[PDB]
Symmetry: C2
Subunit: 852 residues, 2 copies
């Protein structure tokens, strides 16, 4: 091995110009080869390989319902549910205009469109339907005043009316109105504050839930042909354009969000690249300064950098030649190359600079440094390359592609350091007092310090019991990205299919039989099928609805109201405020404290401006005109049979043939947050134990984690075996193999032991750094044992001069570039690599009195 | 020259035995009498774990104000029907009441609901719920009237057959509406036909809110003010088991009484450690005996080691009680540790003498000769193993600070006991393996891979440590099949028992109300109870509504006694109801028709068995109706919500005589999550403790009592090696000999944790004592292994066995097996980790022979 390295350099020194014109030509073809098939792919199912079983179920639900995977989910958020529901209608119509032009796919609001705006009263239970119709029967006089009032002046007139005589008559009571007046006075104070609001008539009567931001969903399914186009900005962009043109949504108080399959998988990649174009170029500067520190020969630094970039282009050229696609995690190889690959040129470049000052000539300096850096560089390279190759045999294409590109990149770095650099180094013709007190302490006391930390690495050994794993990928995919911020927002929403698994069935009768088997499980909870949308006994409900509609609809459709002038408005506000004050003092009670709160607000609102009263009317009246439209539409349902359903509602639940999928939203108790590890694993593992054909959500996430766990466990077992055998081949002394194995063990525990002390959880992308630190762990023992073989009376003195820490400065610079990546998944990987490097560097200086 | 000092003590022991024999035997008599005169076993949970002087103030603040609250054993009276349950509490309560005032036990009461709650129970229902609850009973007046006048089977079957007859045809009553009544009667009727007990419960059918299958009735009794723990009367634990024993009506009421408390739950743990542990102790010696005969095969040698073993053990116990006194649940497990580690020291000396004597020497020269080669070895292993026990002394984990103390003096005795008594004893008296050939040949000729082939895989099994998990709650460590524990693990679902409620104390009732109402703001707090919560809202409007319902319901409830219908009319009234059920199902069909036909089958077959089996269903259907109507009679006359009505004891154990009001906080358990949930109870404890620090009692005490155990466990692991590493420095001054035995410690320390992931072991509290304690055994066996590997460096599987080590481990492994076999996982999992950590130095040393020596 040694002579082969000397021959390969002696040729490079023999024909220097021949190597340069050969390298730049290959550098040209590699640059040509890179651009002609450069591609970045952000598919999320490629970053992990599931077995053919799970692939059949996933494609079964997909090939049957080809749209389900591509359906966008557009959240529309407004301060009031009517303003949200009406904004859904305001936007559902615009997307419909282009769905017919092939611009997008079939648009609908699965939360509940007109089919739910009329028949939503039918989906209720048998008894509480009769209860809801009873309350709407006794409230006939209230809605009779509400459908006729001239809005804010009339709302203040129907207010002042009830506060005057009906309190004296003893019919209406003040404490009962507290629920209305407290929410009325609060909404009035918002308009006086200057911040937007909306008086929700729904949350103050029918709806018990007053959740803060009422939202409305509208889904656009993918275009039929798809395939994307440069001019075809596609369905994610179309929603952006239509809602932009509406502007009405700024008058509705609505914002349009998005999520789905492809917006997040593309947004998470963009989280890695925020700054990465600039974050990587400051690394080259930090490498440069450290590069100049090791070899302060300007005639050398330019030559060292040229070898760095030539091997860098051939890396991507050969990389795209054998993987085809540069995925999300595998794109981080470029940063790892400059950090680890430059080490080959720094370790070799300073020995040449050493030989020149030692007293060698042009021949003897290059081929003489190859005898020092011969099997060392071969050891370090194939050890690091064996670590990247450890994820190759496993079906983890996220790292299997990164290791393949990085592994062959380590051999293209040696071949560049061994030929191109000596050729350039041929054409280009080229004291530490602060370490003194450290080595005096160290060399006089590295006898028990070694025994000291070895006792402490056994002392903190129980800390490994608290070594905790992180299981849900939500933490590492940039939770503040646009698609992940909304995905996490609508987690606690019923029709938001965030956490429900989708089991497929042959027929609808089979799907209903499967739906009952699942509702028997304690964690399953809500399951919906196409038959779930046909209410049990409809004819009985419509009779109670028809009776409630015979007395309400005459009182709901009243003649229009007079546009009240401004003078009547201030009068209606002052006369409603002053009547609220006397109502709270003459009738003292729990609502009296709330009634006086409204008087303070109405009197201030009455004596306020004029623009603030038109806006306040819009927050009180426009919602009331939309709330009454929802009531008149809800009181007129129709028969619902399988053939009386909308066309797309069946297409979403039954494809050609009878294939009916069963979505299973988990039974989430109120305290448990809907996105935890404990219950979603319990749900997904129990509903799968029942029906093995269920995939789609937490079941696919759960099985994807078990694939990654069975991945890095093999790679960590693959590395050592491929490393130990590699060490035994080059160094045949087993006293030299155990010499580089005990430091790996010690350095391996402390990284895990510091994970408990520093309080960091090993997650997914964070755990990739453990198998890699074996090939980098031994590769630094190669550099370190050389800096001390020439002399070891000062371990930190010799380490600087012989340029080993400078080697680490380059590598730590690379690990720090993945640390500052905004994307918390990549930022969690670079944190482990760098912290494990420190536990190896310090570990070496402490643990080399043993193993040298 | 510690070796020369050891010789002075052994050479003196030889030549003159009669001095040694009578000097140590007399001490054993003095030592044995001290053990019998002072043998105090405590069972309090606080003696096993300490806490800050601050947390002991919160514990005693609630205790001094409420002395009774600590030992109020909650006795569950569980019956098939709530009325059979609620009335079974009355039978038990009224009998204990005859001994509460007799001074036999403390004051007796029933928390779930005595007479005060059976009357005012409707006053605690919020204003709107009772408004609809009161109005519903008005429409059931004809129904309850037909039930009050007919508390018999024939009568019940008559009101049954009457409803299915005319009103079912006219549509006055609908058949589907009779779903709960028809389907759950058919279920209860089929139960009586099978022969198994049951009870139609008018509660879960009429009120219909909850149909929980084991109805439970609670009764809390307190302890006597002057608590003396006499023997003429077993304390309140067995008094409830004595009165309700002969009450016998509980076998007729249908309920058994189970008990749980604070002291009766802690003693069930200790008694679980001693299921047959007394037998387990005597069988361990027999196993060590067989190992002793395999080691020094001669009668006079075995009897020598056993006689000196009992002396060192009887003085360890006498010393132990002389400086700790307490011999709690963990401390009592030292004797099995002694028989393992004590015979260990003698196995070395016995077989070294034997070879050295049989190598061509006299007895007197071999006793003093073998003490040379085993001076530093036995001295190192002794203090190094005892330095692991002593690592728990400074920390506040008194369950182990007492065990580590008694075990430390055990090793310092077992050494001295072997060096003097064993030679002088043996001085008074006087006395080939071919199956290792392929195994030793393989390992000896291939130690190049096996060392590297495992040191690699140990590095490859390092990510497994990321899946090592800590079990935080002591409930798993608790013995689950004891009667007191099995009840507390069943009361997770019941709120009035409230097994995990933090108890915050406040100066005044207005202060506690301020603190109790405030705590409700936090999401995990749920229900907080004070005496002001016993004052049911502000409901004279509920007096007006209930009084109106009483004027029409009570006259229909107090009917004249029905003449007991004869037996011949019963088969009539049941066949009349059955054939009517059959018709009512098919001619007027509906969803209830499938159940109406079902009852008809079960009802008809009930009428065709026995006159006794009919009377059997009467005790299930009718005797329940007596109490179901009796419950309603008292429940309709509620009286006032005024503070002064609250009985004397409710004021005593809820507010304080000083005025210190107490808040009990039951966590908001989401209906899906099991109430005894590890993560969310610890979430509830931290939120309550952070908002109001004065809270202690339940989850907070259990949560914090673990944090101090983790701090004591982590210190001992650090304190063990520093004691051991400095000790290795001193004995063997070659640092190449300190690191020689320290690297295999690190290696053997990881492989146990890595196996805890492969095997799947969790690392609880008792499971974790083995981590700091195995640091001594790790360096102690590398002392034993290295001596066997002086003359026989090749064929080391041979040498380790014949030169002492394997018969030594067989005494240690057997000792750890006796801990493994106990019932209490707080002593049965400690034996599993120890034995599994021992196999990583018995194999780890043999594998790492080149690194050792």
């Amino acid at each position: 091995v040694t002579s082969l390295i000397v021959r390969l350099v002696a040729w490079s020194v023999r024909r220097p110009v021949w190597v340069v014109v050969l390298s730049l030509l290959i550098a040209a073809f590699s640059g040509v080869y890179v651009a002609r098939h450069f591609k970045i792919n952000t598919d999320i199912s490629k970053l992990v390989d599931a077995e053919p079983q799970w692939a059949a179920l996933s494609q079964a639900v997909d090939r049957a319902f080809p749209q389900r995977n591509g359906t966008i989910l557009a959240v529309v958020e407004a301060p009031a549910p009517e303003f949200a529901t009406a904004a859904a209608h305001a936007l559902t119509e615009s997307l419909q205009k282009q769905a017919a032009a092939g611009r997008i796919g079939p648009v609908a609001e699965p939360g509940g469109g007109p089919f739910f705006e009329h028949n939503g009263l039918l989906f209720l239970s048998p008894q509480q339907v009769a209860d809801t119709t009873s309350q709407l029967a006794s409230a006939r006089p209230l809605v009779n005043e509400l459908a006729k009032n001239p809005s804010l002046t009339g709302l203040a007139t129907t207010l002042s009316t009830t506060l005057g005589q009906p309190l004296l008559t003893g019919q209406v009571k003040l404490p009962s109105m507290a629920k209305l007046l407290s929410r009325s006075a609060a909404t009035v104070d918002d308009v006086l504050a200057g911040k937007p609001a909306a008086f929700s008539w729904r949350a103050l009567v029918d709806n018990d839930a007053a959740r803060q931001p009422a939202r409305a969903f509208v889904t656009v399914q993918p275009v039929v042909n798809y395939g994307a186009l440069k001019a075809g900005a596609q369905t994610s962009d179309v929603i952006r354009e239509t809602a932009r043109a509406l502007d009405l949504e700024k008058r509705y108080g609505a914002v349009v969000r998005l999520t789905g399959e492809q917006p997040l998988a593309d947004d998470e990649f963009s989280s890695v690249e925020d700054g990465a174009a600039l974050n990587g170029v400051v690394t080259l500067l930090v490498v440069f300064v450290i590069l100049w520190l090791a070899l302060r020969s300007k005639r050398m630094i330019a030559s060292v950098l040229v070898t760095l970039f030539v091997g860098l282009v051939v890396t991507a050229a050969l990389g795209l030649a054998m993987v085809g696609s540069l995925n999300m995690i595998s794109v981080a190889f470029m940063v790892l190359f400059v950090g680890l690959g430059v080490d080959f040129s720094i370790q070799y470049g300073v020995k040449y600079r050493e030989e020149r000052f030692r007293g060698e000539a042009i021949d003897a300096a290059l081929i003489g440094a190859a005898h020092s850096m011969g099997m060392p560089l071969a050891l370090a390279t194939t050890a690091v390359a064996a670590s990247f190759f450890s994820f190759i045999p496993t079906a983890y294409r996220g790292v299997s592609e990164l290791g393949l590109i990085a592994g062959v990149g380590m051999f293209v770095a040696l071949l560049t350091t061994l030929t191109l650099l000596p050729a350039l180094l041929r054409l280009f013709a080229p004291g530490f007092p602060w370490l003194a007190p450290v080595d005096d302490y160290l060399d006089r006391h590295r006898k028990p310090i070694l025994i000291g930390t070895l006792a402490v690495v056994i002392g903190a050994l129980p800390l490994l019991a608290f070594l905790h794993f992180d299981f849900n990928p939500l933490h590492l995919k940039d939770p503040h990205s646009e698609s992940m911020s909304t995905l996490l927002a609508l987690k606690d929403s019923p029709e938001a299919a965030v956490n429900d698994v989708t089991l497929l069935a042959p027929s609808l009768a089979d799907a209903d039989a499967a739906a009952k088997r699942l509702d028997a499980l304690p964690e399953v909870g809500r399951t919906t099928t196409l038959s779930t949308f046909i209410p049990a006994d409809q004819p009985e409900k419509r009779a109670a609805i028809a009776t409630a509609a015979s007395t309400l609809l005459p009182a709901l459709t009243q003649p229009p109201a007079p546009p009240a002038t401004d003078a009547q408005r201030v009068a209606a506000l002052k006369r409603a405020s002053d009547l609220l004050g006397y109502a709270a003092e003459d009738h003292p009670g729990p609502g009296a404290a709330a009634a006086q709160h409204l008087s303070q607000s109405l009197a201030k609102l009455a004596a306020a401006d004029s623009a603030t009263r038109d806006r306040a009317e819009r927050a009180f009246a426009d919602t009331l005109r939309i709330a009454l439209n929802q009531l008149a539409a809800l009181l007129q349902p129709q028969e619902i049979t399988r053939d009386t359903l909308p066309p797309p509602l069946v297409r979403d639940w039954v494809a050609p043939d009878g294939k009916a999928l069963v979505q299973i939203s988990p039974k989430v108790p109120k305290g448990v947050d809907p996105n935890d590890d404990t219950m979603l694993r319990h749900f997904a593992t129990a509903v799968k134990a029942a029906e093995p054909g269920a995939i789609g959500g937490p079941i696919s996430i759960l099985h994807s984690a078990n694939t990654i766990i069975s991945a890095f466990l093999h790679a960590a077992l693959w590395s050592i075996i491929s490393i130990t055998i590699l060490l035994w081949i080059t160094l045949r002394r087993f006293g030299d193999v155990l010499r580089t194995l005990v430091p790996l063990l010690v350095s391996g525990i402390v990284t895990l032991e510091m994970c408990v002390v520093l309080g960091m959880s090993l997650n997914f992308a964070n755990i990739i750094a453990l198998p890699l630190m074996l090939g980098v762990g031994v590769a630094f023992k190669v550099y370190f044992v050389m800096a001390w073989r020439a002399g070891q009376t000062g371990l930190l003195h010799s380490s600087l001069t012989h340029a080993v820490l400078f080697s680490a400065a380059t590598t730590a610079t690379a690990f720090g570039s993945l640390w500052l990546s905004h994307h918390p998944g990549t930022s969690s990987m670079g944190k482990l690599l760098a912290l494990a490097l420190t536990c190896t560097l310090i570990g070496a200086v402490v643990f080399q009195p043993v193993l040298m």
